[PDB]
Design a protein around this ligand. Sequence first.
Ligand SMILES: O=C(O)CC[C@@H](O)C(=O)O
Ligand SMILES: [Cl-]
Ligand SMILES: [Mn+2]
Ligand SMILES: [Mn+2]
Ligand SMILES: [Zn+2]
Ligand SMILES: [Zn+2]
Length: 453
Amino acid sequence: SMFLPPPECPVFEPSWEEFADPFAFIHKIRPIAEQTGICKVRPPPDWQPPFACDVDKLHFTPRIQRLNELEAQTRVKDYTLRTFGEMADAFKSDYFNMPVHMVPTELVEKEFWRLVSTIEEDVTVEYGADIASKEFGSGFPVRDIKLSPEEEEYLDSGWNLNNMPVMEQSVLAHITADICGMKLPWLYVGMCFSSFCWHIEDHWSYSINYLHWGEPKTWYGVPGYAAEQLENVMKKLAPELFVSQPDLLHQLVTIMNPNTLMTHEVPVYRTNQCAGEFVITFPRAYHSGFNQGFNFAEAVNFCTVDWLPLGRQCVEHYRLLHRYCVFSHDEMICKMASKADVLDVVVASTVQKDMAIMIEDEKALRETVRKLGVIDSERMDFELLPDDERQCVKCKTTCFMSAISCSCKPGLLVCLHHVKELCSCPPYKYKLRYRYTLDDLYPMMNALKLRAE
Ligand SMILES: O=C(O)CC[C@@H](O)C(=O)O
Ligand SMILES: [Cl-]
Ligand SMILES: [Mn+2]
Ligand SMILES: [Mn+2]
Ligand SMILES: [Zn+2]
Ligand SMILES: [Zn+2]
């Protein structure tokens, strides 16, 4: 009883009919899978996207990783695929003194949790993690070169992870702001023990991960409802990770044994994802894991209509924590409203409900700041400002609906929750900067209603 493996997460094997629409399928399994945080999806047996690449022309800059439980790592920050693969196979082979396909997955798991907890061991490994570029592209077929019929079959698949974030049931689709770190797929070259620390996705989005080829990836996941339980356990064991961070490039994360969570009554599930299988993580579902050997995976974030209310809650949670946003949720909502006529109807219906809450909150906030003595106001096109020029001084939220400025501190803004935090001038010197009047906003919401019918 060194390591007691968590119970297995749900595994789905959709029929071709079920599989034909990824968003319908994800909606269908949600009641089950949101209880476990992660789930595994095996596509129909003949869904087999062709993979092809020259192992000598693909190069990438590896990240180095120390394997110590509870030690701080930063979430985001030269080999060819062949030379990495050679290093990776030799590492595993020498570590166990065995051929690679002979090392049992149970053993690699048990040994991982041993080595990260033992101070005397100092194993370091390497891995790749980068968004698709011309130097290293998607593992799925994309359009340009002369493609074979096989590749053409998979070009428009919903499960082709390049398409997932442009589909009609997707919400993150119409965002015009630059969120490239979030809407483009990431490519991951793994090796034995290379690991991803406990985290949730930005803005509590979904993620979906496809293992193109190689040895399995071992996952642990925690359902969304238990996120704060996990954070409380982790805060007690590693408070350093929870100090305020200067930006998004300084997110601190760590390796932590799932048995520790289970001891503290945090529900945790596991799975081994093999080549050709999907793993899906649900909103605010903590997950971590490690690779069993040399492999190649591809993952992307996405947001469904189910996620919309959670996205709003997330930004509220970021504000309470003074965490930076990747994008403005309200700006996304208003962009969609301005495109109501071309929106999918269920999407239009869900956006309308979120917009109604947005407007009612904004109404109350503006009444409050008026009572504080802010009188002067001027329209402002917040979406034109670079993000770093429209973050609240206090809580760092990305402003869009409104903010307060003072001629006293040129360029500085606070959101309407932090009117007292801008400067020492009396509020009558302040200006309310707003994107829309309430009277602009109600017709926008009405367009959505008409589209939703
Ligand atoms: O985070 C990683 O490094 C692996 C990707 C995983 O977190 C995912 O959400 O697909
Ligand atoms: Cl160690
Ligand atoms: Mn993730
Ligand atoms: Mn505060
Ligand atoms: Zn603020
Ligand atoms: Zn001032």
